[PDB]
Design a protein around this ligand. Structure first.
Ligand SMILES: [Zn+2]
Lengths: 449, 246, 186, 70
């Protein structure tokens, strides 16, 4: 009966009904996921066997049975939708995940809607409601002639917002009441469905609301061993301005900090400041010692820090961290101690004679200070963490020049002419520690001379 | 005593807070946390003394739980003496040990701060207009280890449940934990008991709990005020409200 | 007729249709849409939660028919017409399974031990859904199927010319299959 | 509608309540003698299962022979 034009809302509703009926569940699934987040949030390791194991652990009879009910709702909904999610959903899903139906023996991770692993399924299902509801809401909006339908987020989600209908209880009586019949003398009875009125009643009853989103993030903390300072640096730079250390200030700190301990102490104060600034921020021109002493109240543990940082300001903080870290390692190298114990030996490959001559030539005609600082920051952030092992886009076989240029670009740092032109491509990422060591030895020789 | 744990906590307050990230992106939070904890970590008033004591006790609990996973936890000094890296970072052995203890305590202190100061909690301890019953309930909850269960942890996210404005806090301490507790008790009573008799069984179970007996100590207007405050926090926890009239 | 050649291959020469796109297919709407973005490493994003700022399958991919309570087709065609296309396709596949089962085992994903019975079950579910949609008896429904096959047989040399319909006899791609579907529907 | 419900219960390829309802329908059909009621039932069965199903029920050794008229 030309419904897509004449009755688009009813058309789309009838198409998606099979799945739209499942929209009523997702407030419950959202509550479940909210409590799961609350329980596991700020946790990093998950040693749970499966959903059956998890339930047995939280075997408090009331809580066990409520969890079981919610989990069963989730599993039913997932089992139905999974074959649609494999094609639709806007969230990609390995075929194995959607392939088979799930049961209590299924891995527990399936219920935590992490943005990776089996939790994508919990995310996908939550997303696939949101499309369906939204899409039919769009259908209604396009015919409401209004542009202010109030939105809502996945936290406030309640049964009042979702499109909750029961086919037999709600819909079938509607159809049967709209289904009308006609007769004429000598002619058979024929139906004539009041399609417009079906649409209007469905709209009046079920259709309103809008959800948005909510969930955790896997990287909960990347603490000391794998700490991702790069994220902190980028957050700060977004929040406030940053600047490099003037060579004067560099030389002053170098003269003051003639001991690894003092370096470490200053650096610990810098790390605290970095965390705070990344969260809060501050005036880039504020002197760092005034900041630590007045605001953070970092007294009682600041003896020579205050004299070294007497000139430095918050904008220098990142550059100061980098200087301190490299100076810290440089001191170790001066004493022949290994500064890169946290680095994989694979990244500590040697430099062949040809590549040694090439590197020596580049370094003689290079900005040795900036080169040393940048290569050190690259090694320490990228090549240090086991976490950066599991993301192996920094393979020893990758070239060093392109890697370092990529890094510098990601932080929108200024490119030195030597980086593209003079830097030899023949040097890979495995010699990076030999490269830094050679550069620091040449610097140390230049300084002793 | 052997060690000035008050000073160690005060030294670790900044490092711990630096571990804390908020969902609502309340930039002005960590600074106020630092001010509040440095003010509270004292023995000036009985409330500060109790807060400090409970902090130490819970730190002891966390550290003992961790120690139950480690070999020869008495040998920690020796292990530090074997960490040339920590030695040379610190210079003096005494500072090495101090740093060791600070590193052990900072994660746990950050965790505890995340639990206690979730929405705006700590404003209640320091704000002078906070009634006595509010501080007493704050410390009662904080002292309890089975009601305010704080699991270990091995970017810490402070799960702010309300959309509260900064400079404002939950009108009832740990309103979120109390709500969770009463909901667990509702579930237990509901499944144990029929739909009729569930109210009485739920009220009785609560009254038999530590918090029920505590609030039973509160009589008269304080309890009425507590109930009003809890209603308000209950609403904020259940329904998102964009206005104060609503 | 040229329109029948894909089905004739399925039935009588299924080996060729191994990597063929069949109307027995749902497709990735993402490939048509070219909201939720994605990072370079692959984890979704609506920088947030990341620290860093084609699913279309071949062969017969439908699993156990028991799940099929309702029919949906992404290409906007009438569900009845797509159902009939699916039914004709399943009949051709049943014939092929009779000719050589292993070929259909290759074409059916996930694998199966009894392809013919599986296709029988799908056909029966198709008939059930047809009855639901049209509102006729089971036998009247099978009669509708026979009517459609008759139409195709009469529209066999009546399709002599005026025949420029972009599709390959082996249904090598997604557009060939869509085009075959739309012609069949017409 | 009662006959329709019975036709559905029979169409299924096993419950006390269904069986008791079917027995009550059997007794009603036998008692009232208005065989039109069974005509409708046979018709509905044919609609749902097909004529061959009704034929198979008519054959000797069948439990639902009461579905049919005299
Ligand atoms: Zn992601």
């Amino acid at each position: 009966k030309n419904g897509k034009e004449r009755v688009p809302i009813l058309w789309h509703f009838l198409q998606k009904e099979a799945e739209l009926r499942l929209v009523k569940f997702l407030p419950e699934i959202l509550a479940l996921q909210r409590d799961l987040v609350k329980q596991f949030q700020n946790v990093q390791q998950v040693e749970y066997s499966s959903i059956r194991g998890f339930l047995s652990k939280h075997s408090s009879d009331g809580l066990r049975q409520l969890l079981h009910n919610r989990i069963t709702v989730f599993l039913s909904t997932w089992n139905k939708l999974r074959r649609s999610l494999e094609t639709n959903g806007e969230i990609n899903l390995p075929k194995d995940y959607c392939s088979t139906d799930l049961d209590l023996d299924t891995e527990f991770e399936i219920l935590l809607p992490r943005r990776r692993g089996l939790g994508l399924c919990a995310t996908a299902l939550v997303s696939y409601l949101i499309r369906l509801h939204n899409e039919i809401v769009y259908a209604v909006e396009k015919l409401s002639k209004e542009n202010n339908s109030y939105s809502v987020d996945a936290a406030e989600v309640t049964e009042l917002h979702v499109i909750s209908y029961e086919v037999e209880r709600d819909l079938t009586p509607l159809i049967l009441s709209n289904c009308q019949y006609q007769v004429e003398e000598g002619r058979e009875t024929v139906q004539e469905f009041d399609l417009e009125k079906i649409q209007r009643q469905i709209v009046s009853r079920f259709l309103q609301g809008k959800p948005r989103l909510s969930l955790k993030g896997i990287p909960t903390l990347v603490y000391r061993h794998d700490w991702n300072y790069e994220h902190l640096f980028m957050d700060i730079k977004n929040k406030m301005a940053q600047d490099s250390l003037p060579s004067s200030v560099i030389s002053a700190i170098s003269g003051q900090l003639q001991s690894y301990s003092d370096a470490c102490e200053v650096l610990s104060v810098v790390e605290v400041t970095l965390g705070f600034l990344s969260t809060a921020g501050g005036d880039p021109n504020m002197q760092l010692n005034v900041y630590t002493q007045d605001i953070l109240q970092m007294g009682d543990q600041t003896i020579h820090v205050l004299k070294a940082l007497n000139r430095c300001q918050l904008k220098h903080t990142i550059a100061l961290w980098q200087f301190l870290s490299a100076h810290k390692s440089e001191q170790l190298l001066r004493l022949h101690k290994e500064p890169f114990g946290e680095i994989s030996s694979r990244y500590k490959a040697d430099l062949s004679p040809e590549n040694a001559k090439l590197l020596s030539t580049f370094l003689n005609q290079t900005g040795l200070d900036a080169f040393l600082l940048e290569l050190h920051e690259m090694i320490i952030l990228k090549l240090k963490n086991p976490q950066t092992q599991t993301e192996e886009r920094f393979r020893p076989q990758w070239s060093l020049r392109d890697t370092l240029v990529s890094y510098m670009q990601t932080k929108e740092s200024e490119i030195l002419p030597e980086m593209a032109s003079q830097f030899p491509e023949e040097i890979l990422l495995a010699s990076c520690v030999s490269v830094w060591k050679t550069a620091a030895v040449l610097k140390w020789n230049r300084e002793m001379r | 005593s052997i060690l000035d744990t008050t000073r160690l906590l005060r030294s670790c307050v900044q490092s711990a807070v630096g571990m804390l990230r908020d969902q609502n992106e309340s930039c002005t939070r960590n600074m106020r946390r630092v001010v509040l904890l440095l003010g509270l970590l004292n023995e000036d008033d009985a409330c500060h003394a109790s807060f400090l004591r409970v902090s130490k006790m819970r730190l002891s609990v966390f550290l003992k739980k961790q120690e139950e996973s480690q070999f020869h936890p008495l040998e920690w000094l020796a292990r530090e003496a074997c960490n040339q890296d920590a030695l040379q970072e610190a210079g003096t052995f005494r500072h090495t040990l101090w740093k060791r203890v600070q590193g052990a305590v900072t994660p746990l202190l950050a965790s505890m701060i995340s639990f206690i100061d979730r929405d705006g909690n700590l404003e209640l301890l320091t704000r002078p207009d906070t009634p006595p019953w509010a501080r007493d309930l704050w410390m009662f909850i904080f002292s309890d280890t089975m009601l305010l269960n704080i699991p270990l942890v091995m970017y810490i996210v402070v799960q702010n449940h309300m959309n509260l404005s900064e400079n404002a806090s939950n009108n009832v301490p740990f309103s979120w934990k109390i709500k969770d507790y009463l909901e667990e008790l509702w579930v237990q009573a509901q499944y144990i008991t029929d739909a009729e008799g569930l109210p009485k069984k739920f009220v009785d179970i609560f009254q038999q709990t530590p918090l029920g007996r505590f609030l039973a100590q509160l009589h008269g207007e304080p309890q009425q005020e507590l109930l009003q405050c809890y209603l308000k926090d209950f609403i904020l926890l259940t329904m998102r409200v964009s206005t104060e009239e609503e | 007729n040229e329109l029948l050649e894909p089905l004739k291959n399925l039935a009588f020469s299924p080996a060729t249709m191994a990597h063929a796109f069949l109307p027995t297919m749902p497709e990735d709407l993402l490939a048509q849409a070219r909201h939720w973005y994605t990072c370079p490493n692959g984890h979704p994003c609506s920088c947030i939660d990341c620290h860093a700022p084609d699913r279309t399958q071949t062969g017969h991919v439908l699993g156990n028919p028991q799940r099929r309570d309702v029919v949906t087709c992404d290409r906007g065609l009438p569900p009845v017409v797509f159902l009939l296309i699916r039914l004709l396709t399943h009949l051709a596949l049943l014939l092929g399974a009779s000719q050589s089962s292993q070929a259909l085992i290759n074409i059916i994903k996930p694998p199966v031990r009894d392809p013919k019975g599986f296709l029988q079950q799908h056909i029966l579910k198709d008939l059930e859904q047809l009855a639901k949609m049209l509102g006729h008896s089971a036998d009247e429904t099978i009669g509708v199927v026979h009517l459609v096959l008759r139409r195709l047989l009469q529209e066999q040399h009546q399709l002599s010319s005026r025949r420029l319909l972009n599709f390959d006899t082996e249904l090598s791609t997604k557009e060939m299959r869509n085009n075959w579907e739309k012609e069949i529907a017409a | 509608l009662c006959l329709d419900r019975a036709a559905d219960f029979l169409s299924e390829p096993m419950a006390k309540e269904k069986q008791c309802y079917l027995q009550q329908v059997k007794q009603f059909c036998i008692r009232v003698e208005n065989d039109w009621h069974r005509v409708y039932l046979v018709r509905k069965l044919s609609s749902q299962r097909g004529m061959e199903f009704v034929q198979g029920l008519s054959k000797p050794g069948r439990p639902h022979q009461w579905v049919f008229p005299k």
